[PDB]
mmCIF file of C-alpha atoms and ligand atoms in Angstrom:
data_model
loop_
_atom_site.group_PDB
_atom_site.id
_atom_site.type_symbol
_atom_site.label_atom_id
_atom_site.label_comp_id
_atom_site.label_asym_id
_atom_site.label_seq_id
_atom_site.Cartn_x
_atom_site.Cartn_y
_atom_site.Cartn_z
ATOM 1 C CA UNK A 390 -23.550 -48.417 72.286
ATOM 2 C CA UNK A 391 -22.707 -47.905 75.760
ATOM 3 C CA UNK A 392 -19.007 -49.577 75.092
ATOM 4 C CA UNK A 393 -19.006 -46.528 72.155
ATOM 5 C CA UNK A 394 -19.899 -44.057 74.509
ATOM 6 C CA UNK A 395 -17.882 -44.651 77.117
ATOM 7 C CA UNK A 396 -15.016 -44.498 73.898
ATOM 8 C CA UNK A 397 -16.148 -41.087 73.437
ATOM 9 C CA UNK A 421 -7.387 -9.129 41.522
ATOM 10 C CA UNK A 422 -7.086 -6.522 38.359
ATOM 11 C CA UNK A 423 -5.935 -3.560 41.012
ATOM 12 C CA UNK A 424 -2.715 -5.492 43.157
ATOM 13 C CA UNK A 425 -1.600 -6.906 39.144
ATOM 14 C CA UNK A 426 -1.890 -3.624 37.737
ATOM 15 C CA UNK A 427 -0.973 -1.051 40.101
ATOM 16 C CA UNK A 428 2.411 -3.926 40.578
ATOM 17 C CA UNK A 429 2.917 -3.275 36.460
ATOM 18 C CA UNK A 430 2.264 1.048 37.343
ATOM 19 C CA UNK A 431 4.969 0.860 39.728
ATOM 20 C CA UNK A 432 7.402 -1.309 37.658
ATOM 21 C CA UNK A 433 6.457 1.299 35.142
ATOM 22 C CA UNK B 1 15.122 -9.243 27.597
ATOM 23 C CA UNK B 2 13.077 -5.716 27.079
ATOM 24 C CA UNK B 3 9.801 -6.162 25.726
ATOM 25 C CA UNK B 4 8.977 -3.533 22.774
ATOM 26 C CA UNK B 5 5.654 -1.580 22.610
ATOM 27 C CA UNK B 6 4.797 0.151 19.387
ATOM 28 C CA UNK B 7 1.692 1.663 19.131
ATOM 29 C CA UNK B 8 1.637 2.592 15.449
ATOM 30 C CA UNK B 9 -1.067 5.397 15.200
ATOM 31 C CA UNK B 10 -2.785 6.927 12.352
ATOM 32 C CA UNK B 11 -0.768 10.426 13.812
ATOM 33 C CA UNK B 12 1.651 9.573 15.625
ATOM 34 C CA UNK B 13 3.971 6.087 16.352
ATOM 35 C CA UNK B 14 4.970 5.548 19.907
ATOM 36 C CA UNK B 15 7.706 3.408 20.169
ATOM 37 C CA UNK B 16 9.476 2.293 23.333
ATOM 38 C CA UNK B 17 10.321 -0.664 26.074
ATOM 39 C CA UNK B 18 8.836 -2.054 28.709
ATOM 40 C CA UNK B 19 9.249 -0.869 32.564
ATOM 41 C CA UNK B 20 9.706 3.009 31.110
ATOM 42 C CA UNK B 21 7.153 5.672 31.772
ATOM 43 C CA UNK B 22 7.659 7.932 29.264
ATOM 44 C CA UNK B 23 7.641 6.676 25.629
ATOM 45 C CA UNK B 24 11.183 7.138 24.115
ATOM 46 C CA UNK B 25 9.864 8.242 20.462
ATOM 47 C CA UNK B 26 7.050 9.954 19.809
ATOM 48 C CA UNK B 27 6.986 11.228 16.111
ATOM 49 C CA UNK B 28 4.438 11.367 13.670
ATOM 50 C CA UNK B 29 3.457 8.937 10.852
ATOM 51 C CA UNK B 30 4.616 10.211 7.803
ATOM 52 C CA UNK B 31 6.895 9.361 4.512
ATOM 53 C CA UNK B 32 7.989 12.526 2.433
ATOM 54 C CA UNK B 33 9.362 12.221 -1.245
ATOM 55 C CA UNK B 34 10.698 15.412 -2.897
ATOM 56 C CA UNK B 35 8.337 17.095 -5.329
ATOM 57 C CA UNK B 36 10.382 19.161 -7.251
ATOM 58 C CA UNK B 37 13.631 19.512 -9.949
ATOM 59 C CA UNK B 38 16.477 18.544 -7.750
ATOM 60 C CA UNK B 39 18.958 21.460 -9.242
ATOM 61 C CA UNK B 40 21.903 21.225 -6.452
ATOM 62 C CA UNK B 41 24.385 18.213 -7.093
ATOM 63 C CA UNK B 42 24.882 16.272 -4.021
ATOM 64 C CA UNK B 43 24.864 17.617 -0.697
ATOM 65 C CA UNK B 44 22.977 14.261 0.659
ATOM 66 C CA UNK B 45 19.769 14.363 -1.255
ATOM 67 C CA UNK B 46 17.580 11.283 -0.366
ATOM 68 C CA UNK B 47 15.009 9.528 -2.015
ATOM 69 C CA UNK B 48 12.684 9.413 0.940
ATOM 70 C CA UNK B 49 12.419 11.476 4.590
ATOM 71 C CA UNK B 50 10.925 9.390 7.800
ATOM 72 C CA UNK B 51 9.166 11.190 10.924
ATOM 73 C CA UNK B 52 10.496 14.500 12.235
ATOM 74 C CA UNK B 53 13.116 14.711 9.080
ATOM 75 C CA UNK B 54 10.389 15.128 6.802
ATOM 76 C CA UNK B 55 8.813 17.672 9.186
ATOM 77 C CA UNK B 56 12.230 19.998 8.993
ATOM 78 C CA UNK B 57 12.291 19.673 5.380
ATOM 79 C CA UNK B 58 8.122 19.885 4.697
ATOM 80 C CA UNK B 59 8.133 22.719 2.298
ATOM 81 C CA UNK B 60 9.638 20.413 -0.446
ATOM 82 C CA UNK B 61 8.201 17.076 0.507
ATOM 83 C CA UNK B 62 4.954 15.447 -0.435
ATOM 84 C CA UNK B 63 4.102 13.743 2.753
ATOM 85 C CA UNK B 64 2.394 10.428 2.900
ATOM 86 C CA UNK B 65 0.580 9.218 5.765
ATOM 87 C CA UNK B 66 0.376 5.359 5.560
ATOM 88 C CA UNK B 67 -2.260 4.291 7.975
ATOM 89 C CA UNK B 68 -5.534 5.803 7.515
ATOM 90 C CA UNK B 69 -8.565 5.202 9.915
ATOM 91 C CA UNK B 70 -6.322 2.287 11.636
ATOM 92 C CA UNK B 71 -5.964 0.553 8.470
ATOM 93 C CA UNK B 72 -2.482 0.232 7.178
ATOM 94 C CA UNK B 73 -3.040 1.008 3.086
ATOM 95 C CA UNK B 74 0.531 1.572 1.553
ATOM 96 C CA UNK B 75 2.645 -1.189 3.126
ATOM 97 C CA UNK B 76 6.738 -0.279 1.643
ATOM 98 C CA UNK B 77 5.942 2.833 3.315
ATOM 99 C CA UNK B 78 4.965 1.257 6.333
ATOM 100 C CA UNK B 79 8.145 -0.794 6.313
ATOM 101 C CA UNK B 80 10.203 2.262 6.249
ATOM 102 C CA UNK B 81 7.690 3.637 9.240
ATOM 103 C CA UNK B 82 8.883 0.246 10.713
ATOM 104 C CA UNK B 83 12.705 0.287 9.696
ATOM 105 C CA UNK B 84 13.078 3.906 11.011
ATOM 106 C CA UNK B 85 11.582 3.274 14.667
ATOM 107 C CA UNK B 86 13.511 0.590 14.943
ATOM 108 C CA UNK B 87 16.734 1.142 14.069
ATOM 109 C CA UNK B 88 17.228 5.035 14.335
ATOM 110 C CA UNK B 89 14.759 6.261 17.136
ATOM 111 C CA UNK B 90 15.190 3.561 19.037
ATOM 112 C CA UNK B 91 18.370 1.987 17.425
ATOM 113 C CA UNK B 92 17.353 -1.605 18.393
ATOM 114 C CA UNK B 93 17.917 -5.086 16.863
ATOM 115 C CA UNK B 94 14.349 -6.877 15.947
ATOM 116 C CA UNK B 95 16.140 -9.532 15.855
ATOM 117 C CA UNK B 96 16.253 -10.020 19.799
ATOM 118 C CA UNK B 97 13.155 -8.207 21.202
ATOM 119 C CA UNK B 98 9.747 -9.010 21.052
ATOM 120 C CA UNK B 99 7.181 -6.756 19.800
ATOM 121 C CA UNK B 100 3.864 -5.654 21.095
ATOM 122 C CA UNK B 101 1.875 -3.843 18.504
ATOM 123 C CA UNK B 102 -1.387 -2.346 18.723
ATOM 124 C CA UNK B 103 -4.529 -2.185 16.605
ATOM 125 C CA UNK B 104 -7.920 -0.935 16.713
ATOM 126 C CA UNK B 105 -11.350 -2.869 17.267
ATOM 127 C CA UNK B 106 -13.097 -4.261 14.174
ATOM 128 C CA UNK B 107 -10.043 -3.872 12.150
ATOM 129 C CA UNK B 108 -9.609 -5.878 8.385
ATOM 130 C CA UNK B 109 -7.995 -8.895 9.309
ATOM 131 C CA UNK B 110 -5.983 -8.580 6.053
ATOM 132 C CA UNK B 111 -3.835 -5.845 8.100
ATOM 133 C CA UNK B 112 -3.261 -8.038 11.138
ATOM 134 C CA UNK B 113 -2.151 -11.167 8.481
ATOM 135 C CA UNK B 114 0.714 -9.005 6.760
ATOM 136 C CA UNK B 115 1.636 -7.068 9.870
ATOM 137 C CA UNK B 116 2.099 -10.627 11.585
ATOM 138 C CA UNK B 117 3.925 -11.595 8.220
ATOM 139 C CA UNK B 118 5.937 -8.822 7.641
ATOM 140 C CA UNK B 119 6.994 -8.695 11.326
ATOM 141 C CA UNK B 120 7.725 -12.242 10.830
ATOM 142 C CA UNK B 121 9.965 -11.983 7.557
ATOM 143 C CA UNK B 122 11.461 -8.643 7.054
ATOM 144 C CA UNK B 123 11.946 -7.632 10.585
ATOM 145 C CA UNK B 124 12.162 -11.181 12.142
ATOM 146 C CA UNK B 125 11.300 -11.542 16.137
ATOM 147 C CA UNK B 126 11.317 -14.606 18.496
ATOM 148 C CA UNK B 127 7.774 -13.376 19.425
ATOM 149 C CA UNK B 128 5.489 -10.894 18.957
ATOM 150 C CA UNK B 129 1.143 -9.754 19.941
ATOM 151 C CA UNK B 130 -1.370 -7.871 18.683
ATOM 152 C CA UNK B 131 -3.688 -6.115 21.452
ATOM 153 C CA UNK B 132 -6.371 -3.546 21.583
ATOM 154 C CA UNK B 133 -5.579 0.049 22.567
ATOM 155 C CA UNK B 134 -8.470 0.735 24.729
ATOM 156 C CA UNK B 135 -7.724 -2.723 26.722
ATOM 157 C CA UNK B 136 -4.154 -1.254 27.315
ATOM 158 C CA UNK B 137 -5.662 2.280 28.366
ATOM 159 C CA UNK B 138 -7.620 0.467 31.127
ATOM 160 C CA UNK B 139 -4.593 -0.884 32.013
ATOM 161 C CA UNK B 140 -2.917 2.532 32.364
ATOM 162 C CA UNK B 141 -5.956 4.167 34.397
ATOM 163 C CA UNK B 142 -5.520 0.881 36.717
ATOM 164 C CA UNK B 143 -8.427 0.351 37.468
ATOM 165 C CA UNK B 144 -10.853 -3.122 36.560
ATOM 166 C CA UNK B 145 -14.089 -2.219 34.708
ATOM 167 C CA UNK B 146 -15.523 0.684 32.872
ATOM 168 C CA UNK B 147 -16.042 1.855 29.322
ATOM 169 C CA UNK B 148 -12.905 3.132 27.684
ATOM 170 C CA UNK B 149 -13.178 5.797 24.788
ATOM 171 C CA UNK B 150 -9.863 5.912 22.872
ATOM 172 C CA UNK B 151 -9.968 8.764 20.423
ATOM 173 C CA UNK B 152 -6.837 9.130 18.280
ATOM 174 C CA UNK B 153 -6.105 10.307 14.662
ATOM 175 C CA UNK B 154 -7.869 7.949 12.453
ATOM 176 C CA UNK B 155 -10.120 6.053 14.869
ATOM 177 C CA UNK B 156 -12.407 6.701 17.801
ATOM 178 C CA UNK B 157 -13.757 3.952 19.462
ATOM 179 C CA UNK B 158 -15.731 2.842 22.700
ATOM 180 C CA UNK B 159 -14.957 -0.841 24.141
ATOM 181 C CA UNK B 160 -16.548 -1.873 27.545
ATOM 182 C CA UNK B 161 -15.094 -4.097 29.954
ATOM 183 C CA UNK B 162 -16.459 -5.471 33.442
ATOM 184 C CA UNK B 163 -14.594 -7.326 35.695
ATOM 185 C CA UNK B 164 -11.749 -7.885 33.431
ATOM 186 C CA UNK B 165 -14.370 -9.250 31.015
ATOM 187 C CA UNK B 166 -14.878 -7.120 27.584
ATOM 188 C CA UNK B 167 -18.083 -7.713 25.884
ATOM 189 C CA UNK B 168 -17.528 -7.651 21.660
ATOM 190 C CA UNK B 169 -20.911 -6.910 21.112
ATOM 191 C CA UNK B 170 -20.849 -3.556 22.550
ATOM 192 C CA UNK B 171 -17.534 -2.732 20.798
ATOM 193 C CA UNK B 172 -18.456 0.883 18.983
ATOM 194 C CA UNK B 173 -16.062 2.000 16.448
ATOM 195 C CA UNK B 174 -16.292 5.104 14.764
ATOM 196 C CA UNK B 175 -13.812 6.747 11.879
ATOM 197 C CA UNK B 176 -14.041 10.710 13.084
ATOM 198 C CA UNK B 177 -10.994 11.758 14.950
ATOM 199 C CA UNK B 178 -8.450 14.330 14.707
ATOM 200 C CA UNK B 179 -7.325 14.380 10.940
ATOM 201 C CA UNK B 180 -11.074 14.634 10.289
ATOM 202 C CA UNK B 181 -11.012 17.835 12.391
ATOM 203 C CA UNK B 182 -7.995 18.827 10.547
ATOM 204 C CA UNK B 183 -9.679 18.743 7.469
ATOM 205 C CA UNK B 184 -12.907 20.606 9.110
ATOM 206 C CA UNK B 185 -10.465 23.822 10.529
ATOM 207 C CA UNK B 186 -8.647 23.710 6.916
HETATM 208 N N1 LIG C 1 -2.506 19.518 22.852
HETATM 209 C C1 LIG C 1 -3.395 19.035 21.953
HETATM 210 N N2 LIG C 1 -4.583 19.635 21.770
HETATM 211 C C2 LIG C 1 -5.475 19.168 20.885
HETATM 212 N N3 LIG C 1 -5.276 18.084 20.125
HETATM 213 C C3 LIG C 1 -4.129 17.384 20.212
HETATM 214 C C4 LIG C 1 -3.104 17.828 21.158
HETATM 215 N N4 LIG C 1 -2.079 16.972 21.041
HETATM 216 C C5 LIG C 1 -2.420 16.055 20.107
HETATM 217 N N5 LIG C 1 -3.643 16.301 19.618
HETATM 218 C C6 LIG C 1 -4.321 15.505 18.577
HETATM 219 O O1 LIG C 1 -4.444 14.148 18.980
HETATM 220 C C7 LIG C 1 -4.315 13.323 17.832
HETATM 221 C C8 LIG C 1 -3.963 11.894 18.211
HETATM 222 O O2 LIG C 1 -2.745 11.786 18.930
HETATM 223 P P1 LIG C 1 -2.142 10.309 19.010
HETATM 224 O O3 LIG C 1 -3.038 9.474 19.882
HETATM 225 O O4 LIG C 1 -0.669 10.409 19.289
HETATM 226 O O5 LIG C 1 -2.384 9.891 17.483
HETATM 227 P P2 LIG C 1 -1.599 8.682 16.785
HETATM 228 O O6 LIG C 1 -1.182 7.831 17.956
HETATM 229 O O7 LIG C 1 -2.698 8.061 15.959
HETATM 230 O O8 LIG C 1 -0.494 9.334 15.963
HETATM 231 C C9 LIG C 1 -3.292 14.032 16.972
HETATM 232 O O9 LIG C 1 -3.598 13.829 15.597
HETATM 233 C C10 LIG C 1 -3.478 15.492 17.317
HETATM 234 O O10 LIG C 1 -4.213 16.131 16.273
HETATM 235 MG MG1 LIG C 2 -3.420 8.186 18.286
#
């Protein structure tokens, strides 16, 4: 021990299709 | 390749293609056949008028609307409905474009089995869908949940949707829409 411790979405889709038209 | 939307109303078909705003034919749903002794030889008389044709020429026409309450009921008629938006409104090739058509909640099932069939056969597509309207008017207001009432000539009907999730038990369908209120002011 001691040797160890030394170690250490509906809208966008939508809205997308609206302005595709 | 353009998609095709169709929504084929009880009123009025709206045909067009995808990425547009405005629909490129609106016309209304109806087949005319003359009703009366032909007496003039000639001069292009047809068997049968489609859409705005048989609106011109209404005061000799019988007019035949073939969907009634959603539900398509004369089905030769319907093909002509079919064979006029497709290749003189919108003057189109079926045989290269798939098809979106739409179709009210709690429809017969008959209807979606020879529109699929018919749509396979006589007007053959590489692919084609059947949606809901109200589904697709959500997707116009662009928003995610809420209850959608979609009130057109034959059918009026309330589907709500949360989170992109509808729930078919609250689907409310109800056969009073504007041809009823036709019929009422007549
Ligand atoms: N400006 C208006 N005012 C009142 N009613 C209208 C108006 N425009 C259309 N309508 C009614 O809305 C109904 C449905 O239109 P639409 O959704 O296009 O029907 P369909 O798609 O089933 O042909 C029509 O039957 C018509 O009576
Ligand atoms: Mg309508």
């Amino acid at each position: 021990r001691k040797q160890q411790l030394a170690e250490e979405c509906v809208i966008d889709a939508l809205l997308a299709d609206i302005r595709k038209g | 390749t353009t998609a095709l939307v169709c929504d084929n109303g009880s009123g009025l078909v709206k045909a067009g293609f995808a990425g547009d705003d405005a629909p490129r034919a609106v016309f209304p749903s109806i087949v005319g056949r003359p009703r009366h002794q032909g007496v003039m030889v000639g001069m292009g008389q047809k068997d049968s008028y489609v859409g705005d044709e048989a609106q011109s020429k209404r005061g000799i026409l019988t007019l035949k609307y073939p969907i009634e309450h959603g539900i398509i009921t004369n089905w030769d008629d319907m093909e002509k409905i079919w064979h006029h938006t497709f290749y003189n409104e919108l003057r189109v090739a079926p045989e290269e474009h798939p098809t979106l058509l739409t179709e009210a909640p709690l429809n017969p099932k008959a209807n979606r089995e020879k529109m699929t069939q018919i749509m396979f056969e006589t007007f053959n597509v590489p692919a084609m869908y059947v949606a809901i309207q109200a589904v697709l008017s959500l997707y116009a207001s662009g928003r995610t949940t809420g209850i959608v009432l979609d009130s057109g000539d034959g059918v009026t009907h309330n589907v709500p949707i949360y989170e992109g999730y509808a729930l078919p038990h609250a689907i409310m369908r109800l056969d009073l829409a504007g041809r009823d209120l036709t019929d009422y002011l007549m």
